[PDB]
Design a protein around this ligand. Sequence first.
Ligand SMILES: [Hg+2]
Ligand SMILES: [Hg+2]
Ligand SMILES: [Hg+2]
Ligand SMILES: [Hg+2]
Ligand SMILES: [Hg+2]
Ligand SMILES: [Hg+2]
Ligand SMILES: [Hg+2]
Ligand SMILES: [Hg+2]
Ligand SMILES: [Hg+2]
Lengths: 83, 84, 84
Amino acid sequence: CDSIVVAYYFCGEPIPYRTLVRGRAVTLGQFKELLTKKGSYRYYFKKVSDEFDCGVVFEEVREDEAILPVFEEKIIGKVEKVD
Amino acid sequence: PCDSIVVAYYFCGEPIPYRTLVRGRAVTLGQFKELLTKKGSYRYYFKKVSDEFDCGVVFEEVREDEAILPVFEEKIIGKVEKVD
Amino acid sequence: PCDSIVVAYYFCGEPIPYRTLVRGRAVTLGQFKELLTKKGSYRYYFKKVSDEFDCGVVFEEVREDEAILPVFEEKIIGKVEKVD
Ligand SMILES: [Hg+2]
Ligand SMILES: [Hg+2]
Ligand SMILES: [Hg+2]
Ligand SMILES: [Hg+2]
Ligand SMILES: [Hg+2]
Ligand SMILES: [Hg+2]
Ligand SMILES: [Hg+2]
Ligand SMILES: [Hg+2]
Ligand SMILES: [Hg+2]
């Protein structure tokens, strides 16, 4: 296994965009390179959270060097345009 | 399978530059800024060819941080200066 | 729309000049002085057209800083020398 599945829902759209990334670990900045549209966005990723009752959160990630959480083996991101 | 970039910067004149690899194709000032360990006010320059003259490439000052750093001969060569 | 000016200076003899863009139409010595990172006593010169001979052009010494820096072929080319 030399890869990870990276899917994100984009600016509201219902069908998420899916791609494979070589590495087993992905950073925000790598994820940012898959995006095609310029502008200001916030990025969230499903992550398990003991501290929440329905198990899941969308963790906001901000720093490029940061390693994105993995939910059930995949990276599930939400990309939201600001404003 | 090329998947990451070399980022070296000279830090306040200390000759020996600090070297690291960054995953991805291109790097922004803000990502570069996350590799730095010391707090404070700094300016940042990066080698990158100019179309002026002798012994000449430039050190381009970058400040935005969603700005994509120039690449000199395939690497990112930065100069980090503390504002005195 | 234009918006900015290119400001490059050679610093203490270092060959590779440092390059930045400055917002606005024209730049003053005092604005130029704010780009500099190192403290101390310096003199500042800028290429500019001249009406004297051999190699055609001069380095005008500027000191006021309310003064507007000359523009050589659309850019500001400065020489910064530490007073030794
Ligand atoms: Hg796999
Ligand atoms: Hg969008
Ligand atoms: Hg719940
Ligand atoms: Hg590489
Ligand atoms: Hg320093
Ligand atoms: Hg030389
Ligand atoms: Hg311009
Ligand atoms: Hg100097
Ligand atoms: Hg000559």
